[PDB]
Design a protein around this ligand. Structure first.
Ligand SMILES: [Mg+2]
Ligand SMILES: [Mg+2]
Ligand SMILES: [Mg+2]
Ligand SMILES: [Mg+2]
Ligand SMILES: [Mg+2]
Ligand SMILES: [Mg+2]
Ligand SMILES: [Mg+2]
Ligand SMILES: [Mg+2]
Ligand SMILES: [Mg+2]
Ligand SMILES: [Mg+2]
Ligand SMILES: [Mg+2]
Ligand SMILES: [Mg+2]
Ligand SMILES: [Mg+2]
Ligand SMILES: [Mg+2]
Ligand SMILES: [Mg+2]
Ligand SMILES: [Mg+2]
Ligand SMILES: [Mg+2]
Ligand SMILES: [Mg+2]
Ligand SMILES: [Mg+2]
Ligand SMILES: [Mg+2]
Ligand SMILES: [Mg+2]
Ligand SMILES: [Mg+2]
Ligand SMILES: [Mg+2]
Ligand SMILES: [Mg+2]
Ligand SMILES: [Mg+2]
Ligand SMILES: [Mg+2]
Ligand SMILES: [Mg+2]
Ligand SMILES: [Mg+2]
Ligand SMILES: [Mg+2]
Ligand SMILES: [Mg+2]
Ligand SMILES: [Mg+2]
Ligand SMILES: [Mg+2]
Ligand SMILES: [Mg+2]
Ligand SMILES: [Mg+2]
Ligand SMILES: [Mg+2]
Ligand SMILES: [Mg+2]
Ligand SMILES: [Mg+2]
Ligand SMILES: [Mg+2]
Ligand SMILES: [Mg+2]
Ligand SMILES: [Mg+2]
Ligand SMILES: [Mg+2]
Lengths: 212, 154, 62
RNA sequence: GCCCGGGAGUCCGGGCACCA
RNA sequence: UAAUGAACAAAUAACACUGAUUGUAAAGGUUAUUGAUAACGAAUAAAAGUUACGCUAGGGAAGGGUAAUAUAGCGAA
RNA sequence: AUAAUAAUAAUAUGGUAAUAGAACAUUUAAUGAUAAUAUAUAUUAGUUAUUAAUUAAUAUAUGUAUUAAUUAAAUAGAGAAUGCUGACAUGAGUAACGAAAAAAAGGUAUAAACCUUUUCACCUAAAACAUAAGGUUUAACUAUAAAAGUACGGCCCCUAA
RNA sequence: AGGUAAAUAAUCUAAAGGGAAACAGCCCAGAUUAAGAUAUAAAGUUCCUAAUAAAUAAUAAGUGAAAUAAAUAUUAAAAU
RNA sequence: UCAUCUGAUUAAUUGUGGUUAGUAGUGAAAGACAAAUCUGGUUUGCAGAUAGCUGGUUUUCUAUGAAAUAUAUGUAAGUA
RNA sequence: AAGUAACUUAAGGAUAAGAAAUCAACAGAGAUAUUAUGAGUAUUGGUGAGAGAAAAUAAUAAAGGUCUAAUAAGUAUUAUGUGAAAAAAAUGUAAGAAAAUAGGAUAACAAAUUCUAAGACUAAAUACUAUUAAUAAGUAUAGUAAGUACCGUAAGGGAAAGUAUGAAAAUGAUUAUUUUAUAAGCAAUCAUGAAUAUAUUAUAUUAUAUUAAUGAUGUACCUUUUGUAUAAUGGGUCAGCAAGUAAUUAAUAUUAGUAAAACAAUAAGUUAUAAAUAAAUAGAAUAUAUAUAAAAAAAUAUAUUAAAUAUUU
RNA sequence: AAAUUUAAUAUAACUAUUAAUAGAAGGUUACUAAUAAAUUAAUAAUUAAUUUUAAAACCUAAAGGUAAACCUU
């Protein structure tokens, strides 16, 4: 094997000169020396876990988005690993195909402005949302961002509809937003949401309902 | 004294016994394995104990002779032929490895008298150990190509 | 397999390398004490090195 | 802390929660 | 320079923070406050005795030292 | 700009609990020449800063290494458990040989102990004679313990608990 | 009190070697392996037992000679 | 075992068979007996119960090398 | 601990389960069975000890769908007592519905989705046995004897022991060499005469080996201890056997492979790539600029982060 | 040209895995508890497959008893 790969393991209770002779690294006569005592036992003083107050909650309704910086995109472009004349919109699916966004995507991607100062690509971008700064940068570039909504299943479909096609000769259509918060978000102009930038039917319907 | 099963006493059990099916299996990154395979092949080639056999796929400079084919295949006569070949090539006692594109049954039959020193392996099941072990390897061209494709690089 | 100590999880939360926790001592018996003094007993606090090992063992997946 | 019994007040005795 | 008490579980208010199909809610959280564990870092909401009928694991987690007292002797009277 | 070996100068080299680094023996798996002038194990004497290996002589195998070496692994090393099993000691040729009456002659120029005769003794409301139960048939034995029944038992009939 | 409780330093614990008759803890000194010529430490130098010669006083009790026993009494000696 | 001593027509002794026992019988009651001995048998199993306790833990060579303090502890033979 | 051991009952070659009064989320899927991931996540606990899903995606699997009910009340449901540490479906006791224009499914209600209870059958993957075949860094104390001998009244417990060979030791007798009857103590080490033995270079005034003249030095070993020659623990001697191992995870290190990606590449998924906050629709140009948190009109102030002709971490 | 060795195989070991296939007599002592074919294929004897066929004491909760291997019908 390569130098530095392997060591000899320590052999206990095998004669004195070895170094780990009779007591074999345990010392003398304790509970530790024979019986098992949980490593993190505190002696009976209230433990670090039991002392402090328990805090917060886990928002299960939460959906953490994968972050993706403009800088990375720019780098990719520079490299020439970014092929977007065929598909004018760089959607999440497209990103994943490229490598752009790697690993699994559960909820969606948020675009973030890390290298906004050095970003200059007149491109149509789609993602689950983007920071204000990023959006501004994109607009400066002469690009076009819109923020879309995808439910898990919908997102999955988007990412690779090929699989869906293979399975049941069809792709599942995109769900509307239903959570009020989500709806609100997509309505918002500053967030650059797909409800107002595309002028969706849902919003209109809601308005009608409100009226009557 | 307790029960008579203590490992302290001659008739008793064994301390820290190993139990039924022991699992010694380990992992290796696929890429690393591929690299190793490639390395083995390279070593073999350097030795000059790599011999490739083939014909149908590539244009031949010299024309394939009669009474002999490129399939890696053959009292039964085949066995005799094999023996003759061995005699010719000074590789009687040494171990050899035939890496084959498909189950050349005839070849295997011919070789089985010399089973102790002869490995005959299907393409997909060839092992690094088997190559390394073998004093001389005989591989089909197609098989070789397949192997290369498998352990490419990308 | 090995599992998180849920109590510890509830108390502690992972921030980069270390863990954060709520200060103890603020639940009651607060009156009469100066509110400027009690400001210190609010807020989070970072794990002392002494006990980091223990924390790590407690919550192996954080 | 709340409710009684001996307009407000005092002084006494019952309960009813709190009991981590 | 003393004048004090952790977490947990309850309770009251504020926060707009999540709202398990959506909307409400419930519930949780954030902030502020409440009552005690005086064996006072608090084992449980809740707990006293006896065994010379006892049993298990262990530990020792008259001699030696001293001469207060005792006996004996001295100096002074 | 490394490694191996050798110099020169310097500093350092006790060690329980403990940490760190490096080796050897044993056994198994992968690869593997060789050879009865060889090998393996043993004894004795050498050799190498030596738990090891090697040399020579000797003795016993064995047509001969899982052999050298590198890896992989371990039921991988024992004076310490009032350890466990086996063997053999020590006390030791010591205590004891378990209620006690033996003698001669002859079986048998084989007998304190077996048998026979005689003498003597012991038990005798027993150490006798009949039996029940019990049990490696121990017996006067394989050529072996004999029943229609009446101071013969079972089974059989009849029931008790 | 070879007691007990803490403070400071050392040693022992975990430290072999020389000395302290023998000796955990005292006095010196820290053993990688030898070798044994030269400095030596603490301790010693009649013999046991490695190594010694002097000088000036005092002691006559074996006091004393590696573990100092007190008040006091007697006798002497110096100084005023 | 020997001697001595007590009951010896009775609440006597004894043969043969049967019934009652393991949260559990029987007991003129001693916690006595329930197959050489029980404040509750034995066997099999749970079972490698658990033990802050005792003992034990096997080759060699090199380098470094402590502590017996503070704080907390139903804690003081333990552990942080 | 654990619905585990145990006891009891009943069936079959397998049994159980099984074609949604199921999951889900407004997009959808489409029986069970149990393996990867999801995930040690949600959920939960004297919020201690600890316990812990489902959807979804993958495998394994077989043709997997298909009527045998004139479609189902003392049933659903409610009250109350129980009831797989998290997710109900069950159940004792009494109250007790409705016709697809109807029921069930979520603390509750309103919307909306979805399924149709009180009738049924069901191969395959699976469990266990037995045989055959293959593979053994498995066993000769896990290598066939024997459930025998023997032990116990009984339930019950339970041996030795293949064949060769054998200069292994402990242990006994004997012989040789040597030392030993004026000498006292871990029986050794060092010094040091003498005697004997062997040696095909003892040429010798030799070399080795054996041996209690004689001298000096020398409180067995382990354990446990502040400390042991201790008259503290343990061992009669020898031979054999007798103790840090495995599984599933987590964190650190070293080296290797690949590298802004890595593993796996069926699809998933895991970690990394962005810090912060309880959480939320918030999130990066020398710092004095910026990001997040508390605060706020915006800054300041505190904490942590990012940011310096180039080639991203 | 026969022997020797090496590796594999038995009616003749168990254990673990993987793959296939299938879902099965003990004792006791004696008046001891046995066999007989056919058909088909292979080559009259033949071996195999497929078959029919004789015997088979006593005991092993439930002809009915008992103290298992006995008795009574
Ligand atoms: Mg050590
Ligand atoms: Mg101790
Ligand atoms: Mg110990
Ligand atoms: Mg300890
Ligand atoms: Mg208390
Ligand atoms: Mg307390
Ligand atoms: Mg109490
Ligand atoms: Mg005393
Ligand atoms: Mg005394
Ligand atoms: Mg050292
Ligand atoms: Mg061992
Ligand atoms: Mg031994
Ligand atoms: Mg030893
Ligand atoms: Mg022993
Ligand atoms: Mg005697
Ligand atoms: Mg005598
Ligand atoms: Mg005698
Ligand atoms: Mg006699
Ligand atoms: Mg005679
Ligand atoms: Mg008479
Ligand atoms: Mg008689
Ligand atoms: Mg003291
Ligand atoms: Mg110590
Ligand atoms: Mg010393
Ligand atoms: Mg020191
Ligand atoms: Mg030194
Ligand atoms: Mg004197
Ligand atoms: Mg003296
Ligand atoms: Mg009777
Ligand atoms: Mg009593
Ligand atoms: Mg009685
Ligand atoms: Mg040192
Ligand atoms: Mg303790
Ligand atoms: Mg079924
Ligand atoms: Mg069914
Ligand atoms: Mg459970
Ligand atoms: Mg139905
Ligand atoms: Mg018996
Ligand atoms: Mg001593
Ligand atoms: Mg002893
Ligand atoms: Mg009868």
């Amino acid at each position: 094997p390569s130098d530095g790969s392997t060591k000899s393991f320590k052999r206990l209770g095998r004669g004195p000169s070895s170094g780990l002779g009779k007591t074999s690294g345990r010392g003398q006569k304790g509970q530790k020396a024979r019986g098992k005592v949980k490593s993190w036992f505190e002696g009976g003083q209230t433990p670090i876990y039991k002392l402090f107050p328990k805090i917060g909650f886990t928002n299960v309704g939460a959906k953490p988005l994968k972050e993706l910086n403009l800088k990375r995109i720019q780098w990719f472009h520079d490299k020439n690993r970014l092929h977007l004349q065929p598909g004018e919109v760089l959607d999440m699916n497209k990103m994943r195909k490229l490598g752009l966004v790697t690993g699994p995507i559960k909820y969606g991607v948020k675009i973030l402005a890390s290298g906004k100062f050095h970003y200059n690509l007149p491109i149509a971008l789609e993602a689950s949302r983007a920071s204000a700064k990023a959006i501004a940068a994109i607009e400066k570039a002469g690009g076009k961002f819109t923020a879309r909504y995808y439910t898990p299943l919908g997102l999955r479909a988007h990412l690779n509809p090929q699989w869906f096609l293979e399975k049941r000769g069809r792709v599942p259509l995109q769900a509307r937003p239903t959570k009020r918060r989500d709806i609100d978000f997509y309505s918002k102009e500053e967030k650059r949401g797909y409800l107002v930038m595309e002028k969706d039917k849902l919003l209109q319907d809601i308005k009608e309902a409100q009226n009557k | 004294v307790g029960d008579a099963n203590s490992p302290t006493r001659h008739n008793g059990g064994r301390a820290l016994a190993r139990t039924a099916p022991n699992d010694y299996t380990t992992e290796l990154p696929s890429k690393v394995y591929s690299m190793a395979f490639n390395n083995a092949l390279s070593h073999q080639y350097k030795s000059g104990k790599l011999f490739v056999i083939g014909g149908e796929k590539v244009d031949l400079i010299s024309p394939t002779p009669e009474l002999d084919l490129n399939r890696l295949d053959l009292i039964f006569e085949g066995e005799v032929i094999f023996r003759k070949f061995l005699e010719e090539f000074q590789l009687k006692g040494k171990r050899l490895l035939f890496i084959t594109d498909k189950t050349r049954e005839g070849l295997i039959k011919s070789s089985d008298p010399y089973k102790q020193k002869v490995d005959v392996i299907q393409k997909e099941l060839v092992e690094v150990n088997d190559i390394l072990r073998a004093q001389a390897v005989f591989i089909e061209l197609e098989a070789l190509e397949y192997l290369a494709m498998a352990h490419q690089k990308e | 397999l090995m599992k998180t100590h849920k109590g510890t999880a509830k108390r502690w939360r992972r921030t980069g390398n270390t863990f954060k926790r709520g200060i103890a001592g603020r639940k009651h018996g607060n009156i009469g004490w100066s509110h400027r003094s009690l400001k210190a007993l609010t807020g989070r606090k970072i794990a002392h090195p002494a006990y980091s090992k223990h924390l790590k063992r407690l919550l192996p997946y954080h």
